[PDB]
C-alpha cells in the first residue's frame, strides 16, 4: 500500500491550506490509525495529527485533520512563516504496518525576489603545476533556492566535467549553490575564455575568466 501526497503546496500568510493524503482507508471493520508529521530542515519529524481528528498537547489548534473515503486531509489555518516545512502522512494497516507518504513541501509565499551574486575563479598556478585544472563558480544570495548552471568556452556550450551542487538555505533565509568544471591544463589555456552562466527566474547573470 502507498500513500500519495502532493509534491508541493504553496500559500500566503493568512491563507489557509489543505494537504491531502490519498492512500489507506481500507479494511472496513478495521480502524483508522492515521497520523501527520511536520519536519523542518535538519530536525526530527514532529507529530502534529494522529487518530485522524486528534491533536496532541502543544500543537497549535490551527492544524486539523479529516478523512473522507480513501483520502485524508491536513488543514492548516492562518498560515505563518514558521509553517514552511515538509509534511508527511502515515497509516497503520494489517497488510503494511505503517506507510509514510511521499511528502509535501509547504512554501509560504510573499517573500521578495533576489538575484544571485556569482563569483568565478580561474584555476590556480599551483593547481596547473599539478597538471590539473578546476573552475569554481559560486552562487550566493538568491531567493528562492531554484537555479540552473551552464558552462561555456568561447560561446560553445560544454557538458564534460560539470559537478553542480543542490541549493542550500543560508543563515539569512536565502540559498546558495556551487558548480565545478574540471579541465586538463591544455583545455584551459588553449581556449580564449571560460564563462559560468547562472540563470535564476529567467534572469541570467554571467561571469567570465581567461588565462
Amino acid at each position: 500500500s502507498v500513500l500519495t501526497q502532493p509534491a508541493s503546496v504553496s500559500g500566503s500568510p493568512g491563507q489557509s491550506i489543505t494537504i491531502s493524503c490519498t492512500g489507506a482507508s481500507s479494511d472496513v471493520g478495521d480502524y483508522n490509525y492515521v497520523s501527520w508529521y511536520q519536519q523542518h530542515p535538519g530536525k526530527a519529524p514532529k507529530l502534529m495529527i494522529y487518530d485522524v481528528s486528534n491533536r496532541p498537547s502543544g500543537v497549535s489548534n490551527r492544524f486539523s485533520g479529516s478523512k473522507s473515503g480513501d483520502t485524508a486531509s491536513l488543514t492548516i489555518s492562518g498560515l505563518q512563516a514558521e509553517d514552511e516545512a515538509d509534511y508527511y502522512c502515515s497509516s497503520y494497516t494489517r497488510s503494511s504496518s505503517v506507510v509514510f507518504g511521499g511528502g509535501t513541501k509547504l512554501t509560504v509565499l510573499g517573500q521578495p525576489k533576489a538575484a544571485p551574486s556569482v563569483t568565478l575563479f580561474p584555476p590556480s598556478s599551483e593547481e596547473l603545476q599539478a597538471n590539473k585544472a578546476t573552475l569554481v563558480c559560486l552562487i550566493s544570495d538568491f531567493y528562492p533556492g531554484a537555479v540552473t548552471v551552464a558552462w561555456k568556452a568561447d560561446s560553445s556550450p560544454v557538458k564534460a566535467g560539470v559537478e553542480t551542487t543542490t541549493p542550500s538555505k543560508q543563515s539569512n533565509n536565502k540559498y546558495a549553490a556551487s558548480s565545478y568544471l574540471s579541465l586538463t591544463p591544455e583545455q584551459w589555456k588553449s581556449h580564449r575564455s571560460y564563462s559560468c552562466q547562472v540563470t535564476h527566474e529567467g534572469s541570467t547573470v554571467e561571469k567570465t575568466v581567461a588565462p
Binding site: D27, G29, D30, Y31, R94
Partner: protein, 387 residues
C-alpha cells in the same frame, strides 16, 4: 449418572465469596506454578480449579519472560478449589497454551490446544484418555474459552476461534459426547468477534458471553441448543462490560466501536431481559471488579442499573473472569446455580517484574444477604527473583 441440565438458572440477588487461593502470596516462599487463565469447573461431587501453567515456579529463573502466552512448556493442570497450584497437589490434564474443561456427569472432559500457531491442534480427553483431535482450520492461532464448557443431557459444548485477533475471524460451536466431536457449525457472524467465551447451560440450552477483541467494548453473545441452531447478538446495555471500554453511555445491540479494540475475557448471566454483569472498575487498565444487575440490560440500551456489588477495589489488579455453574446433581437444589471466578493478574506488563502470574477468587450466587468488599491478590511485588 449423566448431568441432565434441564433446569433454569436460579434467580440471584447477590454474590457470596466461595474461594480464595492466595497463590502469588504463598508463591513467594512455597513451590507454586506460574499460572495464567485459571477457571473453575464442577463435577456432581466436587469442584476443581483448572489453569494453564508455564512449566515453571514462582521466584525461579525459569519464570523469566513468562508474558508469552504460547510455549511448548505450558500445560493444563487442575487442583482442588482454594488450594495453591503447586506441583505437589496439582493433577495433570493436557499439554496446552489454551484450554477448556467440563464434566458431563461421569468423567472429566479436557480440551488442550498446543502446536505451532499455523497448525495448532486441540487434544480432547475423556477420563484422561485421548478421544478426539481437531486441527486449526484457518492457520491463525486456534483458541478456546479458557473457562469451563457446558454439558447438557450428556453432551458438552464449547466455542473455538481461528483467525485474526484484530479483525474478522472464524468461530465454531462444537458438541462433544464422551470426548468425541459429534457435530460442529461455523457461525455466520459478519462484523462480530468472538474470543474466550464464558458458556453456561440454561434450561436445556447454552448461552455464551464472549469477548470482542476486534471492535467491541460491549460483550458479544451466542446461544444454541443441542442441534447447534444458534442466535447471535451483543449485550445491549449501556453498562459496558469489556475492558477497555468507554464511560457508561447509550449502548447498542451491535458492537460498540468506541474503545472497541482489544478487551478482556468476561462473563454475564442473562435473566429474561436482565443481566448480571461482571466487569473491571477501571475503564483503561485491568483494575478492580464489580457485579452489576441491570434489570433491562440484555435488550435495552440505557445506562441505568439497580444493583452494584464491589468485588475488588478499583486500585488493585484484576484480570480474566469467567462463569461456572453448580448443577442440581451437585447442590441438591431444583435449579442450576450460577457462580463466577476472577483472575488477579500480577507482574508484567503493569509491574516491574520478570514474570506474570495470577491468583483467583470465586463467588457463588445466593438469594440471601451479601456484602461488597475488596479481596485482592495481596502479593508484595517485586519478588526476590526480580532484583
Amino acid at each position: 449418572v449423566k448431568l441432565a441440565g434441564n433446569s433454569s438458572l436460579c434467580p440471584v440477588s447477590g454474590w457470596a465469596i466461595y474461594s480464595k487461593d492466595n497463590s502469588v502470596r504463598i508463591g513467594s516462599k512455597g513451590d507454586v506454578f506460574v499460572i495464567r487463565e485459571p477457571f473453575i469447573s464442577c463435577s456432581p461431587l466436587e469442584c476443581r480449579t483448572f489453569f494453564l501453567t508455564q512449566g515453571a515456579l514462582l521466584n525461579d529463573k525459569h519464570s523469566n519472560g513468562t508474558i508469552k502466552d504460547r510455549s511448548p512448556y505450558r500445560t493444563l493442570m487442575s487442583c482442588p478449589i482454594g488450594e495453591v497450584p503447586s506441583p505437589y497437589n496439582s493433577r495433570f490434564e493436557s499439554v496446552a497454551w489454551s484450554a477448556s474443561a467440563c464434566h458431563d456427569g461421569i468423567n472429566w472432559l479436557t480440551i488442550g490446544i498446543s502446536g505451532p500457531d499455523s497448525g495448532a491442534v486441540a487434544v480432547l480427553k475423556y477420563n484422561g484418555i485421548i478421544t478426539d483431535t481437531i486441527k486449526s482450520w484457518r492457520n491463525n492461532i486456534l483458541r478456546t474459552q479458557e473457562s469451563e464448557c457446558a454439558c447438557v443431557n450428556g453432551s458438552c459444548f464449547t466455542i473455538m476461534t481461528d483467525g485474526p485477533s484484530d479483525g474478522q475471524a472464524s468461530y465454531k460451536i462444537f458438541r462433544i459426547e464422551k470426548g468425541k466431536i459429534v457435530k460442529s457449525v461455523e457461525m455466520n457472524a459478519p462484523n462480530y468477534h468472538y474470543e474466550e467465551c464464558s458458556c453456561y447451560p440454561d434450561s436445556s440450552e447454552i448461552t455464551c458471553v464472549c469477548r470482542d477483541n476486534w471492535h467491541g467494548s460491549n460483550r458479544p453473545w451466542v446461544s444454541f441448543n443441542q442441534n447447534l441452531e444458534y442466535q447471535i447478538g451483543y449485550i445491549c446495555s449501556g453498562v459496558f462490560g469489556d475492558n477497555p471500554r468507554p464511560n457508561d453511555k447509550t449502548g447498542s445491540c451491535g458492537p460498540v466501536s468506541s474503545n472497541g479494540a482489544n478487551g478482556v475475557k468476561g462473563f454475564s448471566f442473562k435473566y429474561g431481559n436482565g443481566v448480571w454483569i461482571g466487569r473491571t472498575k477501571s475503564i483503561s487498565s485491568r483494575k478492580g471488579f464489580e457485579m452489576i444487575w441491570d434489570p433491562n440490560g440484555w435488550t435495552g440500551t440505557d445506562n441505568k442499573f439497580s444493583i452494584k456489588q464491589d468485588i475488588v477495589g478499583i486500585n488493585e489488579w484484576s484480570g480474566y473472569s469467567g462463569s461456572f455453574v453448580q448443577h442440581p446433581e451437585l447442590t441438591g437444589l431444583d435449579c442450576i446455580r450460577p457462580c463466577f471466578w476472577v483472575e488477579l493478574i500480577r507482574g508484567r506488563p503493569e509491574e516491574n517484574t520478570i514474570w506474570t502470574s495470577g491468583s483467583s477468587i470465586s463467588f457463588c450466587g445466593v438469594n440471601s444477604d451479601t456484602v461488597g468488599w475488596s479481596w485482592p491478590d495481596g502479593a508484595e511485588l517485586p519478588f526476590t527473583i526480580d532484583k
